[PDB]
Amino acid sequence: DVNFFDELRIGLATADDIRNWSYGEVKKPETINYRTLKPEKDGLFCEKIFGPT
Amino acid sequence: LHHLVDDKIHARSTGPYSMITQQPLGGKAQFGGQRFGEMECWAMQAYGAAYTLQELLTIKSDDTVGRVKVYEAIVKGENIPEPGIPESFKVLLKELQSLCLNVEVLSSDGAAIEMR
Amino acid sequence: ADSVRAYLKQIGKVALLNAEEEVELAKRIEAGLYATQKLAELAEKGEKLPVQQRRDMQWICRDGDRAKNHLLEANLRLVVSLAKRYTGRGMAFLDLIQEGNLGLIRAVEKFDYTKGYKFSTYATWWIRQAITRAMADQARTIRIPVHMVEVINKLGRIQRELLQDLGREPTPEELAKEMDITPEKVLEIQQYAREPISLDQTIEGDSQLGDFIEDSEAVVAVDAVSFTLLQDQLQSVLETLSEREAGVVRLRFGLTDGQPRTLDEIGQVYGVTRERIRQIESKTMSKLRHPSRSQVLRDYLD
Amino acid sequence: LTPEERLLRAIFGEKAREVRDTSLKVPHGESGKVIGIRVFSREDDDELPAGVNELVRVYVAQKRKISDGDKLA
Amino acid sequence: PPRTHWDMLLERRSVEELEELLKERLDLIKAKRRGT
Amino acid sequence: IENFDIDAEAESLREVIRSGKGQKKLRALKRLKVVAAFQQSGNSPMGMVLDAVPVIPPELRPMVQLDGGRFATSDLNDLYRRVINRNNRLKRLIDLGAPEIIVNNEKRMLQESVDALFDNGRRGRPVTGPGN
Amino acid sequence: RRLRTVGELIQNQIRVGLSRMERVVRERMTTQDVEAITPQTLINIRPVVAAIKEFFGTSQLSQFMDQNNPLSG
Amino acid sequence: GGLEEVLAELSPIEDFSGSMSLSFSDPRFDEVKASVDECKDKDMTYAAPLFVTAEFINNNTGEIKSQTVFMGD
DNA sequence: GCTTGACAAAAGTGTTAAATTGTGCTATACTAGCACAATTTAACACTTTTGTCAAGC
Numbered sequence: 001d002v003n004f005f006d007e008l009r010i011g012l013a014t015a016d017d018i019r020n021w022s023y024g025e026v027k028k029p030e031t032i033n034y035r036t037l038k039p040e041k042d043g044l045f046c047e048k049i050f051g052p053t
Numbered sequence: 054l055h056h057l058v059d060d061k062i063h064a065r066s067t068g069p070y071s072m073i074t075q076q077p078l079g080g081k082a083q084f085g086g087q088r089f090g091e092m093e094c095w096a097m098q099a100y101g102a103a104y105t106l107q108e109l110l111t112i113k114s115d116d117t118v119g120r121v122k123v124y125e126a127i128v129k130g131e132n133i134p135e136p137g138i139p140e141s142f143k144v145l146l147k148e149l150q151s152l153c154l155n156v157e158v159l160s161s162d163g164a165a166i167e168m169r
Numbered sequence: 170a171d172s173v174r175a176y177l178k179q180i181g182k183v184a185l186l187n188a189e190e191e192v193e194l195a196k197r198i199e200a201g202l203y204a205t206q207k208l209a210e211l212a213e214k215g216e217k218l219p220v221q222q223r224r225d226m227q228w229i230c231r232d233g234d235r236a237k238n239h240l241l242e243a244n245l246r247l248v249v250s251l252a253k254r255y256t257g258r259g260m261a262f263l264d265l266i267q268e269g270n271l272g273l274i275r276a277v278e279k280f281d282y283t284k285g286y287k288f289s290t291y292a293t294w295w296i297r298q299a300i301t302r303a304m305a306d307q308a309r310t311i312r313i314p315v316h317m318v319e320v321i322n323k324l325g326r327i328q329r330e331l332l333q334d335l336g337r338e339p340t341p342e343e344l345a346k347e348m349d350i351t352p353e354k355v356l357e358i359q360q361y362a363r364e365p366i367s368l369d370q371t372i373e374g375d376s377q378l379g380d381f382i383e384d385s386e387a388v389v390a391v392d393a394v395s396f397t398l399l400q401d402q403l404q405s406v407l408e409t410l411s412e413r414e415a416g417v418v419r420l421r422f423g424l425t426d427g428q429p430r431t432l433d434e435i436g437q438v439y440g441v442t443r444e445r446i447r448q449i450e451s452k453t454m455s456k457l458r459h460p461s462r463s464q465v466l467r468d469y470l471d
Numbered sequence: 472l473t474p475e476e477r478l479l480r481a482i483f484g485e486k487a488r489e490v491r492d493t494s495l496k497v498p499h500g501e502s503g504k505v506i507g508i509r510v511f512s513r514e515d516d517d518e519l520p521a522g523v524n525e526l527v528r529v530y531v532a533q534k535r536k537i538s539d540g541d542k543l544a
Numbered sequence: 545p546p547r548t549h550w551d552m553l554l555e556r557r558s559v560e561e562l563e564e565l566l567k568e569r570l571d572l573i574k575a576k577r578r579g580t
Numbered sequence: 581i582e583n584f585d586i587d588a589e590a591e592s593l594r595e596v597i598r599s600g601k602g603q604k605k606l607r608a609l610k611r612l613k614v615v616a617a618f619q620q621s622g623n624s625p626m627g628m629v630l631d632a633v634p635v636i637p638p639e640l641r642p643m644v645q646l647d648g649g650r651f652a653t654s655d656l657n658d659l660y661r662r663v664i665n666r667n668n669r670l671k672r673l674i675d676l677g678a679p680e681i682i683v684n685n686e687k688r689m690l691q692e693s694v695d696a697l698f699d700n701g702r703r704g705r706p707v708t709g710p711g712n
Numbered sequence: 713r714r715l716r717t718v719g720e721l722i723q724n725q726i727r728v729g730l731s732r733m734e735r736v737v738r739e740r741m742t743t744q745d746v747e748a749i750t751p752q753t754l755i756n757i758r759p760v761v762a763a764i765k766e767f768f769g770t771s772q773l774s775q776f777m778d779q780n781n782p783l784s785g
Numbered sequence: 786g787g788l789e790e791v792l793a794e795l796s797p798i799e800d801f802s803g804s805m806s807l808s809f810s811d812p813r814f815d816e817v818k819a820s821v822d823e824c825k826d827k828d829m830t831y832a833a834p835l836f837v838t839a840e841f842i843n844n845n846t847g848e849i850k851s852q853t854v855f856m857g858d
Numbered sequence: 859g860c861t862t863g864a865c866a867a868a869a870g871t872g873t874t875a876a877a878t879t880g881t882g883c884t885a886t887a888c889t890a891g892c893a894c895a896a897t898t899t900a901a902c903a904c905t906t907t908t909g910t911c912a913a914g915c
């Protein structure tokens with residue numbers, strides 16, 4: 001948390017840039033289990049990639 | 054007439070915050086705070102009150118760590134801390150990334166800075 | 170101009186087949202498939218073949234795929250014919266069409282010409298199943314499994330039939346008996362059948378719903394400070410206790426490490442029987458309850 | 472629970488309860504008296520939406536003396 | 545271990561049925577090149 | 581874009597403006613603006629075609645149960661759901677081996693989903709949920 | 713310039729519910745066995761009562777009655 | 786009647802072939818379920834069930850199938 | 859001040875039965891429900907650990 005930085009730059013995000021940012025590839029169109037209501041693995045809220053609940 | 058004081062007076066020091074954005078959520082339902090909109094920022098900028106404007110947009114609404122530290126400062130009677138990065142701005146950076154726009158905050162050195 | 174309008178333009182460019190045409194294509198597709206498997210088994214067993222015979226065997230393998238693709242492109246209109254009837258149930262028309270094409274593929278894979286039945290007779294089952302199977306798999310944002318999607322449709326079916334028999338919407342006990350399930354089961358099913366709503370939706374005027382959700386784990390500044398003030402008050406009590414006594418209370422609750430510790434594990438650090446640790450714990454706790462030591466923390470109760 | 476909190480539970484002997492308090496309180500600034508209460512219960516054969524057991528509605532009224540800031544016309 | 549097009553074909557026809565089919569197909573190409 | 585000499589496309593574009601002045605010069609002039617913008621920068625123009633698509637964090641596209649047990653969630657989830665669904669189905673069609681019409685149809689659908697994900701309604705029919 | 717009164721505003725929403733019923737009745741006829749159909753088999757009312765419920769429930773024309781004073785209502 | 790007006794529009798639902806034709810007629814209303822004061826109490830809609838008198842005729846076999854249909858509240 | 863044995867409660871553990879879940883399939887011609895396998899979840903018998911008591915060095 002510096003709060004004093006000089007420049008702000010924008011540019012086209014290459015496939016490698018996107019590839020690099022991601023903490024994992026979401027593989028399933030699943031949001032959450034319908035009974036447990038907990039996030040489905042490899043899905044859109046998968047804790048494995050996005051983070052702990 | 055159905056406009057009455059008891060229903061229209063609102064006051065807020067601290068309270069709940071939105072889940073997506075970290076600003077106070079308005080309305081009487083949530084003990085909400087008042088909105089400092091686009092025109093109001095123009096007036097403050099016209100006055101030249103940079104610190105008053107920064108205070109309103111960083112540690113009164115969106116600074117997840119700033120708003121809690123200022124409360125700690127007021128209770129302890131200490132000076133009010135230096136503001137942080139508005140969560141709204143950080144959310145903006147992520148929303149640009151999601152559009153395949155590589156935005157990089159840069160210092161004098163030209164080195165990228167981890168926004169975390 | 171329009172996406173679907175473009176797809177129908179191209180599927181129509183292949184003329185629909187007749188029975189004899191289907192049977193022949195179904196033969197070549199089958200011979201090529203066996204000609205392919207034959208050659209693969211040979212290498213494992215040896216069994217070299219006549220150089221020439223292998224040549225026109227490999228061409229039969231190649232020739233079967235034209236029969237496969239020609240058969241698919243001819244019956245694409247059939248898929249669209251079936252997919253139209255399922256629009257508007259939570260799936261885009263094109264997605265229905267594609268999943269239908271998947272069913273058409275298997276129908277070709279599983280077709281049998283020796284039965285002498287027209288192709289549309291048998292392919293309709295696979296296209297219909299592929300579309301509905303897909304809807305249960307995808308149409309819902311939370312994705313109920315197929316068997317549970319099956320019991321929901323069956324339950325609504327029952328409520329519908331009964332409603333006409335009764336003249337009123339049924340009670341949970343009636344649906345439970347009519348379906349041969351428990352009344353708490355049907356209630357649990359009706360909770361599963363609930364479908365979500367959009368935060369990005371707006372409600373009166375210019376206010377999207379999303380702005381009203383509280384962040385529950387967001388640190389509340391009035392409590393976090395008191396917690397810091399509380400842990401400072403506890404730091405005072407420990408200095409009053411014996412050095413061994415203060416050390417025991419922490420480890421038992423792991424104030425410094427952040428993790429509790431069992432007595433036997435507290436015995437290793439202090440080299441004493443775990444019962445002694447239990448005894449020291451009992452004596453120190455009672456002394457903490459002593460009037461002088463705990464007076465301050467009463468107010469910090471809540 | 473918190474290591475700091477679990478100790479206070481052991482000192483003052485108040486068992487950390489197994490459940491969270493989500494009670495219906497009166498909104499800020501609102502005041503008055505309770506006129507009536509309506510109660511719909513699952514135990515009794517009341518009709519409720521799936522998953523809902525009991526419903527209770529409290530009606531509060533208040534006398535509003537004409538006050539500074541009220542709007543007349 | 546998926547269920548492939550071969551498995552689905554073997555389930556409905558024995559190797560002798562497939563073999564006779566292959567013989568017919570082989571004779572067709574055989575007649576094309578050999579006979580004008 | 582792979583077979584693109586981005587200097588000679590630029591220079592051949594660079595000279596025509598002064599010689600063929602007229603209506604066609606304006607077409608070349610404006611076109612030179614974007615061609616030179618890539619020349620000065622060291623960033624490749626391949627970025628205009630995505631091999632992978634980033635997924636916004638869940639907190640910014642939340643799915644929470646407002647009280648009453650009912651659930652609400654951002655439209656982004658259904659938009660991401662459309663993209664990943666058609667992406668996987670495409671993989672399935674490739675692995676099986678499928679007529680070009682079916683595969684091409686799936687690729688067009690996939691492209692449209694990413695378009696709807698980024699700017700919905702910008703190209704043709706906007707994707708709608710319940711209540712249109 | 714005319715004004716669609718309440719009775720017609722209901723009538724129009726009834727018409728929409730009967731039209732989507734017309735389509736289901738049509739498809740129901742084909743895949744159903746001849747002589748195995750009765751007026752009950754061809755008709756699922758889900759669209760009709762949904763049209764009435766949706767209109768009263770959602771439509772802009774169906775409004776929460778403002779009752780602060782009898783003149784307002 | 787507004788309901789009869791919309792029913793005259795659908796009757797009859799004729800097959801493409803016209804082999805099977807289904808006719809609607811004679812709307813029927815039952816007495817209200819509960820009073821306005823009871824509906825505002827129990828959070829239910831003030832409604833009266835609506836029966837209809839339909840019919841399905843087969844031109845091939847000439848059979849007549851009459852029935853009573855419950856549209857809804 | 860500390861230790862030991864008897865002991866019960868609690869927490870693991872491996873083994874099994876039940877449920878949950880996913881995939882395949884339906885053959886007049888037309889251009890939902892069930893069977894079965896796979897996987898997950900519960901149940902349970904059984905073993906180790908942990909907290910506890912009385913009694914004694």
Ligand SMILES: CC(=O)O[C@H]1[C@H](C)[C@H](O)[C@H](C)[C@@H](O)[C@@H]([C@H](C)OC(=O)C(C)(C)CC(=O)O)CC/C=C(/C)C(=O)Nc2cc(O)c3c4c(c(C)c(O)c3c2O)O[C@](C)(O/C=C/[C@H](O[C@H]2C[C@@H]3OCO[C@@H]3[C@@H](C)O2)[C@H]1C)C4=O
Pocket residue numbers: 373769770771772773774775776777778
């Ligand atoms: C839920 C609901 O009933 O809200 C209603 C409305 C608020 C209540 O009826 C309210 C009691 C109101 O009657 C009284 C009240 C004193 O006035 C006010 O509340 C305000 C503060 C606004 C004005 C004021 O007090 O000064 C009296 C107002 C007196 C006058 C001369 C007046 O101005 N009338 C008035 C006001 C309107 O704005 C609209 C309006 C509208 C249509 C088609 C109308 O004919 C409107 C109308 O005639 O289209 C819009 C874009 O959107 C539609 C929005 C809503 O419609 C619902 C319909 C469905 O019901 C539930 O789901 C739907 C929901 C999402 O939308 C409106 C129609 C919309 O703005």
